[PDB]
Design a protein around this motif. Structure first.
Motif, PDB file in Angstrom:
ATOM      1  N   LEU A  87     -13.910   6.266  12.772  1.00  0.00           N
ATOM      2  CA  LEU A  87     -13.238   7.559  12.814  1.00  0.00           C
ATOM      3  C   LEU A  87     -12.120   7.592  11.790  1.00  0.00           C
ATOM      4  O   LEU A  87     -11.909   8.607  11.125  1.00  0.00           O
ATOM      5  N   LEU A  88     -11.422   6.476  11.628  1.00  0.00           N
ATOM      6  CA  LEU A  88     -10.340   6.438  10.638  1.00  0.00           C
ATOM      7  C   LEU A  88     -10.905   6.505   9.217  1.00  0.00           C
ATOM      8  O   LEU A  88     -10.316   7.137   8.330  1.00  0.00           O
ATOM      9  N   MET A  89     -12.063   5.882   9.011  1.00  0.00           N
ATOM     10  CA  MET A  89     -12.765   6.019   7.737  1.00  0.00           C
ATOM     11  C   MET A  89     -13.119   7.471   7.481  1.00  0.00           C
ATOM     12  O   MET A  89     -13.030   7.938   6.347  1.00  0.00           O
ATOM     13  N   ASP A  90     -13.562   8.174   8.515  1.00  0.00           N
ATOM     14  CA  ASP A  90     -13.888   9.590   8.353  1.00  0.00           C
ATOM     15  C   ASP A  90     -12.657  10.444   8.047  1.00  0.00           C
ATOM     16  O   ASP A  90     -12.716  11.335   7.203  1.00  0.00           O
ATOM     17  N   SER A  91     -11.555  10.187   8.745  1.00  0.00           N
ATOM     18  CA  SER A  91     -10.297  10.899   8.489  1.00  0.00           C
ATOM     19  C   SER A  91      -9.889  10.715   7.024  1.00  0.00           C
ATOM     20  O   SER A  91      -9.501  11.673   6.342  1.00  0.00           O
ATOM     21  N   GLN A  92      -9.975   9.476   6.549  1.00  0.00           N
ATOM     22  CA  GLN A  92      -9.685   9.172   5.153  1.00  0.00           C
ATOM     23  C   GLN A  92     -10.649   9.888   4.206  1.00  0.00           C
ATOM     24  O   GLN A  92     -10.237  10.469   3.185  1.00  0.00           O
ATOM     25  N   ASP A  93     -11.935   9.842   4.552  1.00  0.00           N
ATOM     26  CA  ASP A  93     -12.979  10.424   3.728  1.00  0.00           C
ATOM     27  C   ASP A  93     -12.734  11.914   3.535  1.00  0.00           C
ATOM     28  O   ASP A  93     -12.821  12.435   2.420  1.00  0.00           O
ATOM     29  N   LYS A  94     -12.446  12.596   4.636  1.00  0.00           N
ATOM     30  CA  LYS A  94     -12.262  14.040   4.599  1.00  0.00           C
ATOM     31  C   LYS A  94     -10.948  14.375   3.879  1.00  0.00           C
ATOM     32  O   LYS A  94     -10.861  15.374   3.171  1.00  0.00           O
ATOM     33  N   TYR A  95      -9.938  13.523   4.028  1.00  0.00           N
ATOM     34  CA  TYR A  95      -8.739  13.668   3.201  1.00  0.00           C
ATOM     35  C   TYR A  95      -9.048  13.561   1.692  1.00  0.00           C
ATOM     36  O   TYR A  95      -8.497  14.314   0.872  1.00  0.00           O
ATOM     37  N   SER A 115     -10.710  16.103   9.121  1.00  0.00           N
ATOM     38  CA  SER A 115      -9.878  14.914   9.098  1.00  0.00           C
ATOM     39  C   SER A 115      -9.056  14.860  10.391  1.00  0.00           C
ATOM     40  O   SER A 115      -8.956  13.809  11.043  1.00  0.00           O
ATOM     41  N   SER A 116      -8.489  16.004  10.766  1.00  0.00           N
ATOM     42  CA  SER A 116      -7.665  16.100  11.965  1.00  0.00           C
ATOM     43  C   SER A 116      -8.463  15.815  13.220  1.00  0.00           C
ATOM     44  O   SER A 116      -7.982  15.125  14.113  1.00  0.00           O
ATOM     45  N   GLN A 117      -9.672  16.370  13.299  1.00  0.00           N
ATOM     46  CA  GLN A 117     -10.534  16.130  14.453  1.00  0.00           C
ATOM     47  C   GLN A 117     -10.835  14.640  14.582  1.00  0.00           C
ATOM     48  O   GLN A 117     -10.846  14.090  15.677  1.00  0.00           O
ATOM     49  N   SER A 118     -11.069  13.986  13.456  1.00  0.00           N
ATOM     50  CA  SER A 118     -11.354  12.545  13.486  1.00  0.00           C
ATOM     51  C   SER A 118     -10.140  11.709  13.900  1.00  0.00           C
ATOM     52  O   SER A 118     -10.281  10.736  14.657  1.00  0.00           O
ATOM     53  N   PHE A 119      -8.951  12.073  13.426  1.00  0.00           N
ATOM     54  CA  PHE A 119      -7.740  11.389  13.902  1.00  0.00           C
ATOM     55  C   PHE A 119      -7.608  11.536  15.421  1.00  0.00           C
ATOM     56  O   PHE A 119      -7.275  10.581  16.138  1.00  0.00           O
ATOM     57  N   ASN A 120      -7.848  12.750  15.903  1.00  0.00           N
ATOM     58  CA  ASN A 120      -7.771  13.059  17.330  1.00  0.00           C
ATOM     59  C   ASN A 120      -8.756  12.250  18.154  1.00  0.00           C
ATOM     60  O   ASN A 120      -8.436  11.760  19.252  1.00  0.00           O
ATOM     61  N   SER A 137      -7.606   8.733  18.163  1.00  0.00           N
ATOM     62  CA  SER A 137      -6.515   8.598  19.148  1.00  0.00           C
ATOM     63  C   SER A 137      -7.024   8.389  20.576  1.00  0.00           C
ATOM     64  O   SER A 137      -6.559   7.487  21.301  1.00  0.00           O
ATOM     65  N   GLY A 138      -7.978   9.219  20.977  1.00  0.00           N
ATOM     66  CA  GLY A 138      -8.602   9.104  22.289  1.00  0.00           C
ATOM     67  C   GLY A 138      -9.142   7.706  22.537  1.00  0.00           C
ATOM     68  O   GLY A 138      -8.957   7.137  23.621  1.00  0.00           O
ATOM     69  N   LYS A 139      -9.802   7.151  21.529  1.00  0.00           N
ATOM     70  CA  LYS A 139     -10.382   5.814  21.639  1.00  0.00           C
ATOM     71  C   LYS A 139      -9.308   4.725  21.642  1.00  0.00           C
ATOM     72  O   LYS A 139      -9.427   3.724  22.343  1.00  0.00           O
ATOM     73  N   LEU A 140      -8.255   4.931  20.871  1.00  0.00           N
ATOM     74  CA  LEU A 140      -7.137   4.006  20.897  1.00  0.00           C
ATOM     75  C   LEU A 140      -6.458   3.997  22.273  1.00  0.00           C
ATOM     76  O   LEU A 140      -6.018   2.946  22.737  1.00  0.00           O
ATOM     77  N   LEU A 141      -6.391   5.156  22.931  1.00  0.00           N
ATOM     78  CA  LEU A 141      -5.849   5.218  24.291  1.00  0.00           C
ATOM     79  C   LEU A 141      -6.760   4.460  25.251  1.00  0.00           C
ATOM     80  O   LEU A 141      -6.277   3.753  26.137  1.00  0.00           O
ATOM     81  N   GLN A 167       0.791  10.421  15.301  1.00  0.00           N
ATOM     82  CA  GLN A 167       1.730  11.039  14.371  1.00  0.00           C
ATOM     83  C   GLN A 167       1.003  11.697  13.204  1.00  0.00           C
ATOM     84  O   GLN A 167       1.295  12.848  12.844  1.00  0.00           O
ATOM     85  N   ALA A 168       0.062  10.965  12.606  1.00  0.00           N
ATOM     86  CA  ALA A 168      -0.770  11.507  11.526  1.00  0.00           C
ATOM     87  C   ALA A 168      -1.492  12.772  11.969  1.00  0.00           C
ATOM     88  O   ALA A 168      -1.578  13.742  11.215  1.00  0.00           O
ATOM     89  N   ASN A 169      -2.015  12.763  13.190  1.00  0.00           N
ATOM     90  CA  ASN A 169      -2.730  13.919  13.716  1.00  0.00           C
ATOM     91  C   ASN A 169      -1.806  15.142  13.771  1.00  0.00           C
ATOM     92  O   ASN A 169      -2.179  16.229  13.337  1.00  0.00           O
TER      93      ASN A 169
END
Length: 291
Positions: A63-71, A132-137, A140-144, A226-228
């Motif tokens: 997901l973080l790779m995707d957030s980066q990719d879309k950025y 990118s935002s959806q992927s950060f979100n 986040s869910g998975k990190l929780l 925070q990034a989200n």
């Protein structure tokens, strides 16, 4: 000719301000470099995690790779606009030389293309930022979920923790009564600790190691949340500025460019253009343009 001067300056400044939401906000407020290094590191110790935790860690990485990719996708879209804008604005400036009515018309068409391309490209980039935002979100869910999982795995009474202990002890007993024993997640333990010659120190050593791993993810979790929040904020400021571009474009369209500009007016208009050329050059440079 002062009226035209204020419309035209406002047009360039508004476009410039939008560009800067990438160049001085989005590119800065989110730690992209840190995420890149973290993404590349995230498979470390993959075989050491529990099955459940390992799946979460892998999905967080994806997901973080995707957030980066879309950025990066948003970035290339904005970069394209920047590259055209810089050529257009330079053309705008040169058109003041040996001025006439044909050059004034060209100047007008040129600034309107800057604004119009801006709207089109910035709108396309909004879609990338959204994903990118959806992927950060989702990350986040998975990190929780990962925190609760690691808590269960890393508690002293779990079979996970007990296996780690048993393995370390078994290895220590099976070898020579000296030296060191390698444990999980990079832990090295002296024989005397591992074998309990020095009493009651093995469990605390393992816990300290495990807590440090859980902490790492807690930090990543905070950093992702925070990034989200920040990317959502940037995307909203952009919506506003994209509308503002539309407005000034309309007023520009009905503005007369052919004017008997004095030295001051000319200075102000060229500097306005040069300010955006500077913004665009700095942005493209950061994103790899050579010269």
């Amino acid at each position: 000719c002062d009226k035209t001067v204020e419309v035209v300056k406002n047009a360039i400044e508004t476009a410039d301000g939008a560009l800067d939401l990438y160049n001085k906000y989005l590119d800065q407020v989110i730690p992209w470099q840190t995420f890149d290094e973290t993404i590349k590191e995230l498979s470390r110790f993959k075989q050491e995690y529990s099955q459940a935790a390992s799946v979460l860690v892998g999905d967080i990485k994806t997901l973080l790779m995707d957030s980066q990719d879309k950025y990066f996708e948003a970035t290339q879209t904005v970069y394209e606009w920047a590259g055209v804008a810089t050529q257009l604005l330079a053309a705008y400036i040169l058109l003041f030389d040996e001025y006439n009515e044909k050059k004034a018309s060209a100047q007008k068409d040129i600034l309107i293309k800057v604004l119009d391309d801006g709207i089109t490209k910035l709108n396309e980039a909004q879609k990338s930022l959204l994903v990118s935002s959806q992927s950060f979100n989702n990350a986040s869910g998975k990190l929780l979920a990962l925190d609760s999982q690691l808590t269960n795995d890393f508690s002293e009474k779990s079979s996970y923790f007990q296996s780690q202990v048993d393995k370390i002890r078994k290895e220590a007993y099976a070898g020579a009564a000296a030296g060191v024993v390698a444990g999980p997640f990079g832990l090295i333990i002296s024989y005397s600790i591992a074998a309990g010659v020095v009493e009651g120190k093995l469990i605390p050593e393992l816990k300290n190691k495990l807590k440090s791993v859980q902490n790492f993810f807690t930090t990543l979790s905070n950093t992702v949340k925070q990034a989200n929040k920040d990317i959502d904020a940037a995307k909203l400021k952009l919506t506003t500025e994209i509308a503002a571009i539309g407005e000034i474009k309309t007023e520009t369209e009905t503005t007369r460019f052919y004017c008997d500009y004095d030295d001051l007016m000319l200075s102000l208009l060229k500097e306005a253009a040069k300010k955006m050329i500077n913004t665009a050059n700095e942005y493209q440079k950061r994103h790899g343009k050579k010269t």
